Structure formats: structure tokens, C-alpha cells
Amino acid sequence: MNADEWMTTFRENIAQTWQQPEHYDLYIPAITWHARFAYDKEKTDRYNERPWGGGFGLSRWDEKGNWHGLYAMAFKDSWNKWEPIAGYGWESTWRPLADENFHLGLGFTAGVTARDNWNYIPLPVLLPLASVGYGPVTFQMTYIPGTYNNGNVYFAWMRFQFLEHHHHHH
């Protein structure tokens, strides 16, 4: 409200956002497309309940118009099993004129699925993704090309930008 009070208030938010980069991102299931489109009647005769997982990760920017893409999440199976995922690649995000928060672009990230075993050891995988959103609304897109019918699916998940998300105390 005051003169110096209004300054320190803004300077604190702008200085903390520029001094403390890298934000804690988190994603979760929302809506996905189907490629098979077949009448599932083999392993779905009755209503089945499957567990879910938590999505997380961070991102970076390069002065050379580069967008670092890093993923970090873990899924739980019905028979107890944590599946750690880690992405690493580059993405090209375009910025508007007047606006700034609103970003739209695409890229390629390689996710690595770890697994404890003497055969199913952690192996990397190539999967193209995209980033489109604005403010607290982040849209995560991911397609899987192939041939024509079995290679043209799209994925959609929710994404939120938070910090720490573990504890404050202060």
C-alpha cells in the first residue's frame, strides 16, 4: 500500500522469481486417445480398478532459444511396483507478441523406465512431446508416430507449476 511497501512487495516477487529459477512441475492423468479402437472383451469382462501415480519434473531455458525438458515421476502397480521415469531432450517453444506466459511449441524427449531385474533393466525410449499453456494452466501433449493406423495417437495430461510442495515452516 505504502510507497516503499509496494516496492518491496513487488521486488520480492520479481527478485525471488529471477533469483530462484527452476520450478517444481507436476502432471497427472486426464484424457488419452485410443489407437486400437477394438471391442475389448478379453481382459475386461468385468469392472477392474487400477492404481494411479504422481507426475513431476522440471524445465530449463537456453539463451540460444532452447527449452530443456526433464521428466520425473513414479507409477504404482496393483502388485506393488514403482516405475521411475526420467526424460531428457530439447524442445522449441514460441512466444507471442504482447503476451508472454502463453507458450506454444513442440520437441523431443527421451524417457527412461527403470526396472529391478536380470533382464528388464532400465532402458531408454524416444517419445515426442509438446508444451502449450498459460499461467496455472499447462497442457502436456505427446504423440506416437508409426506407420498410419497404428502410428498416430495423441495424449493429453494436466500440468501445474508449484514450488517445493513438501513443507514450508518458514
Side-chain angles (χ1 to χ4, degrees):
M1 273 282 286
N2 217 233
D4 301 23
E5 288 260 83
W6 217 336
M7 191 152 143
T8 183
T9 33
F10 234 54
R11 251 99 206 290
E12 266 275 285
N13 216 26
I14 310 156
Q16 276 217 236
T17 48
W18 273 26
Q19 284 211 51
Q20 268 89 356
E22 258 112 55
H23 267 151
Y24 216 92
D25 279 76
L26 60 97
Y27 49 89
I28 53 93
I31 51 176
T32 171
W33 266 37
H34 306 246
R36 270 238 93 79
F37 220 97
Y39 218 63
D40 271 301
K41 270 270 174 299
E42 216 181 292
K43 205 108 263 149
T44 176
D45 216 303
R46 217 178 96 76
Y47 204 120
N48 261 76
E49 216 242 332
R50 300 215 138 166
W52 270 3
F56 291 116
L58 320 84
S59 270
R60 269 176 72 165
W61 58 102
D62 209 41
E63 209 208 283
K64 271 267 221 142
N66 223 348
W67 205 263
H68 247 59
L70 273 291
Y71 301 137
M73 64 97 105
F75 196 80
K76 47 161 98 67
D77 293 341
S78 47
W79 55 276
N80 220 289
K81 199 276 212 92
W82 315 308
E83 276 267 288
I85 315 300
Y88 189 91
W90 57 279
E91 298 139 44
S92 269
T93 173
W94 211 233
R95 315 164 295 281
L97 273 87
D99 217 44
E100 215 127 290
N101 304 329
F102 182 55
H103 62 79
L104 209 180
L106 295 91
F108 298 82
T109 319
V112 298
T113 322
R115 261 219 212 184
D116 196 287
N117 244 62
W118 58 277
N119 61 280
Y120 227 103
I121 58 95
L123 296 145
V125 294
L126 274 147
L127 216 74
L129 309 93
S131 292
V132 62
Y134 46 100
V137 189
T138 302
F139 231 108
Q140 203 255 103
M141 271 207 174
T142 303
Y143 45 98
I144 48 142
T147 59
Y148 253 104
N149 270 107
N150 194 20
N152 217 66
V153 188
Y154 292 102
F155 288 109
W157 281 338
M158 300 217 130
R159 260 198 153 198
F160 270 114
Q161 216 185 241
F162 216 70
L163 179 71
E164 292 225 67
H165 195 227
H166 265 223
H167 218 59
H168 203 155
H169 192 111
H170 219 345

